[PDB]
Scaffold this active site. Structure first.
Site, PDB file in Angstrom:
ATOM      1  N   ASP A 158       0.540  -1.476   0.322  1.00 31.79           N
ATOM      2  CA  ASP A 158       0.170  -0.165   0.056  1.00 31.79           C
ATOM      3  C   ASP A 158       0.881   1.065   0.410  1.00 31.79           C
ATOM      4  O   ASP A 158       0.532   2.049   0.856  1.00 31.79           O
ATOM      5  CB  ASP A 158      -0.951   0.073   0.818  1.00 31.79           C
ATOM      6  CG  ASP A 158      -2.034   1.482   1.676  1.00 31.79           C
ATOM      7  OD1 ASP A 158      -2.608   1.649   0.035  1.00 31.79           O
ATOM      8  OD2 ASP A 158      -2.347   0.882   2.317  1.00 31.79           O
ATOM      9  N   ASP A 185      -6.549 -10.026   3.819  1.00 31.89           N
ATOM     10  CA  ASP A 185      -7.913 -11.445   3.731  1.00 31.89           C
ATOM     11  C   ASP A 185      -9.437 -10.401   4.456  1.00 31.89           C
ATOM     12  O   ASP A 185     -10.532 -10.491   3.535  1.00 31.89           O
ATOM     13  CB  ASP A 185      -7.553 -12.344   4.207  1.00 31.89           C
ATOM     14  CG  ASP A 185      -6.893 -12.819   3.687  1.00 31.89           C
ATOM     15  OD1 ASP A 185      -5.961 -13.014   2.481  1.00 31.89           O
ATOM     16  OD2 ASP A 185      -6.500 -14.657   3.800  1.00 31.89           O
TER      17      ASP A 185
HETATM   18  N1  LIG Z   1       1.531   7.733  12.903  1.00 34.18           N
HETATM   19  C1  LIG Z   1       0.428   8.548  12.236  1.00 34.18           C
HETATM   20  N2  LIG Z   1       1.028   9.809  12.883  1.00 34.18           N
HETATM   21  C2  LIG Z   1       0.148  11.239  11.796  1.00 34.18           C
HETATM   22  N3  LIG Z   1      -0.522  11.077  11.109  1.00 34.18           N
HETATM   23  C3  LIG Z   1      -0.976   9.811  10.451  1.00 34.18           C
HETATM   24  C4  LIG Z   1      -0.566   8.654  11.132  1.00 34.18           C
HETATM   25  N4  LIG Z   1      -0.815   7.088  10.680  1.00 34.18           N
HETATM   26  C5  LIG Z   1      -1.707   8.072   9.523  1.00 34.18           C
HETATM   27  N5  LIG Z   1      -1.857   9.035   9.659  1.00 34.18           N
HETATM   28  C6  LIG Z   1      -2.953  10.564   8.964  1.00 34.18           C
HETATM   29  O1  LIG Z   1      -4.344   9.315   8.617  1.00 34.18           O
HETATM   30  C7  LIG Z   1      -4.826   9.673   7.845  1.00 34.18           C
HETATM   31  C8  LIG Z   1      -5.781   9.152   6.890  1.00 34.18           C
HETATM   32  O2  LIG Z   1      -4.647   7.085   7.294  1.00 34.18           O
HETATM   33  P1  LIG Z   1      -5.369   6.429   6.773  1.00 34.18           P
HETATM   34  O3  LIG Z   1      -6.444   6.576   7.297  1.00 34.18           O
HETATM   35  O4  LIG Z   1      -4.460   5.763   6.590  1.00 34.18           O
HETATM   36  O5  LIG Z   1      -5.822   6.936   4.903  1.00 34.18           O
HETATM   37  P2  LIG Z   1      -4.474   6.106   3.638  1.00 34.18           P
HETATM   38  O6  LIG Z   1      -3.680   6.429   4.362  1.00 34.18           O
HETATM   39  O7  LIG Z   1      -5.017   7.169   2.979  1.00 34.18           O
HETATM   40  N6  LIG Z   1      -5.700   4.410   3.379  1.00 34.18           N
HETATM   41  P3  LIG Z   1      -4.660   3.125   3.684  1.00 34.18           P
HETATM   42  O8  LIG Z   1      -3.517   3.361   4.866  1.00 34.18           O
HETATM   43  O9  LIG Z   1      -4.881   2.185   2.690  1.00 34.18           O
HETATM   44  O10 LIG Z   1      -6.101   2.318   4.896  1.00 34.18           O
HETATM   45  C9  LIG Z   1      -3.784  10.653   7.119  1.00 34.18           C
HETATM   46  O11 LIG Z   1      -3.848  11.448   6.225  1.00 34.18           O
HETATM   47  C10 LIG Z   1      -2.055  10.276   7.282  1.00 34.18           C
HETATM   48  O12 LIG Z   1      -1.130  11.859   7.344  1.00 34.18           O
HETATM   49  C1  LIG Z   2      -4.321  -1.975   3.973  1.00 34.82           C
HETATM   50  C2  LIG Z   2      -3.166  -0.933   5.081  1.00 34.82           C
HETATM   51  N1  LIG Z   2      -3.903  -2.058   6.636  1.00 34.82           N
HETATM   52  C3  LIG Z   2      -4.963  -1.150   6.883  1.00 34.82           C
HETATM   53  C4  LIG Z   2      -3.065  -2.419   6.969  1.00 34.82           C
HETATM   54  C5  LIG Z   2      -2.844  -1.604   8.384  1.00 34.82           C
HETATM   55  C6  LIG Z   2      -1.361  -2.166   9.258  1.00 34.82           C
HETATM   56  C7  LIG Z   2      -0.419  -1.091   9.420  1.00 34.82           C
HETATM   57  C8  LIG Z   2      -0.724   0.200  10.054  1.00 34.82           C
HETATM   58  C9  LIG Z   2      -0.194   1.246  11.249  1.00 34.82           C
HETATM   59  C10 LIG Z   2       1.335   0.925  10.880  1.00 34.82           C
HETATM   60  C11 LIG Z   2       1.397  -0.448  10.718  1.00 34.82           C
HETATM   61  C12 LIG Z   2       0.605  -1.626   9.698  1.00 34.82           C
HETATM   62  O1  LIG Z   2       1.229  -2.994   9.965  1.00 34.82           O
HETATM   63  N2  LIG Z   2      -1.302  -3.380   8.842  1.00 34.82           N
HETATM   64  C13 LIG Z   2      -1.368  -4.438   7.878  1.00 34.82           C
HETATM   65  N3  LIG Z   2      -1.657  -5.437   7.874  1.00 34.82           N
HETATM   66  C14 LIG Z   2      -2.356  -6.445   6.535  1.00 34.82           C
HETATM   67  C15 LIG Z   2      -2.927  -4.987   6.540  1.00 34.82           C
HETATM   68  N4  LIG Z   2      -2.912  -4.002   7.163  1.00 34.82           N
END
Ligand SMILES: Nc1ncnc2c1ncn2[C@@H]1O[C@H](COP(=O)(O)OP(=O)(O)NP(=O)(O)O)[C@@H](O)[C@H]1O
Ligand SMILES: CCN(C)c1cc(-c2ccccc2O)nc2nccn12
Ligand SMILES: [Mg+2]
Length: 301
Positions: A158, A185
């Site tokens: 991702d 999954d």
């Molecule tokens: N550890 C963190 N510290 C600060 N901001 C964070 C952190 N993790 C995620 N974010 C923020 O959270 C927001 C949403 O993240 P997220 O829900 O993962 O959406 P996404 O990255 O677009 N999709 P995905 O990772 O595939 O689920 C983003 O704008 C990131 O900058």
């Molecule tokens: C496809 C993104 N998703 C939601 C996902 C996130 C994380 C995960 C999230 C934040 C930091 C460390 C991580 O590892 N771990 C996963 N394992 C399977 C899917 N995972």
């Protein structure tokens, strides 16, 4: 603390930062829903929502990602078990992890709060990210992907600007990598998926390299470089890959992104090749004040 980090070959600044995170983490034991207080929402994606929270027992501020999953308790417990592997993922290029647990229909993944947010958030404010800054980002992404593959035998799955986090200390780290096979999954307008992943093909490190190349073009140009859902995916699969505009970017950076975006995954560069590419060798030698650039661009500190 008896640090066993010799295998990482850390520089002094990286060693100090990683030992400081791990020392703070020692204040954190079992995570429970009642021990958090929500501060604000950091952002949200398709699968979850991320909150900036205070962990009351430790006093630490964390980023808590909540993923709604109300499935067979035994399979959700397998996801939680698989997420515990994150306790072994210590690298300067990987977001710090505090713990993961399940509570009332939601899986929580608790991470180090990165005060610069993600490069997707930075991009909205900067407009475009300078090539020298993208050199440092590229080094961090390649190093993070190499760490996950070599030490943990996992692929990211991702890679995109919202999964590259940054902070006011100038650190660049990956998040949201596929540590849990069962979570993968059990689980839109823009796609960072490789042409072969869109078509069917088993996941390869090569698909992460395509994602990184596309992310670099987006961040360099200030817009997603590829509109209807079928039209966008048909373009990725059946049309030439995007290229950086000539003249505005160095020949090294153009060649680097071109090697990431080769349609055939066998011809596309691998992590070993990218690490020795002229773009990476040049970028590694450059003195860039990433922290200063970040704080100035988004108004931090
Ligand atoms: N550890 C963190 N510290 C600060 N901001 C964070 C952190 N993790 C995620 N974010 C923020 O959270 C927001 C949403 O993240 P997220 O829900 O993962 O959406 P996404 O990255 O677009 N999709 P995905 O990772 O595939 O689920 C983003 O704008 C990131 O900058
Ligand atoms: C496809 C993104 N998703 C939601 C996902 C996130 C994380 C995960 C999230 C934040 C930091 C460390 C991580 O590892 N771990 C996963 N394992 C399977 C899917 N995972
Ligand atoms: Mg994310």
């Amino acid at each position: 603390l008896y640090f066993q980090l010799e295998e990482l070959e850390l520089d002094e600044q990286q060693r100090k930062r990683l030992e400081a995170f791990l020392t703070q983490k020692q204040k954190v034991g079992e995570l429970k829903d009642d021990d958090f207080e929500k501060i604000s929402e950091l952002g949200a994606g398709n699968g979850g929502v991320v909150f900036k929270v205070s962990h009351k027992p430790s006093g630490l501020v964390m980023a808590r990602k909540l993923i709604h999953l109300e499935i067979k308790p035994a399979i959700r417990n397998q996801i939680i078990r698989e997420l515990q592997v994150l306790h072994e993922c210590n690298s300067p290029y990987i977001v710090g992890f505090y713990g993961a647990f399940y509570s009332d229909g939601e899986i929580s993944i608790c991470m180090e709060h990165m005060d610069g947010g993600s490069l997707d958030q930075v991009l909205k404010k900067a407009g475009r990210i300078p090539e020298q800054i993208l050199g440092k980002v590229s080094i961090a992404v390649i190093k993070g992907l190499t760490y996950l593959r070599e030490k943990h035998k996992i692929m990211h799955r991702d890679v995109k600007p919202s999964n590259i986090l940054v902070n006011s200390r100038g650190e660049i780290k990956l998040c949201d990598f596929g540590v849990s096979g069962q979570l993968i999954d059990s689980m839109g307008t823009r796609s960072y998926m490789s042409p072969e992943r869109l078509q069917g093909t088993h996941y390869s490190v090569q698909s992460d390299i395509w994602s990184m190349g596309l992310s670099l073009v987006e961040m360099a140009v200030g817009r997603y470089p590829i509109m209807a859902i079928f039209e966008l995916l048909d373009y990725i699969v059946n049309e030439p890959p995007p290229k950086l505009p000539s003249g505005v970017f160095s020949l090294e950076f153009q060649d680097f992104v071109n090697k990431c975006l080769i349609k055939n995954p066998a011809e596309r560069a691998d992590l070993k090749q990218l690490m020795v590419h002229a773009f990476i060798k040049r970028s590694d030698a450059e003195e860039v004040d990433f922290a200063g650039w970040l704080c100035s661009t988004i108004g931090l500190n």
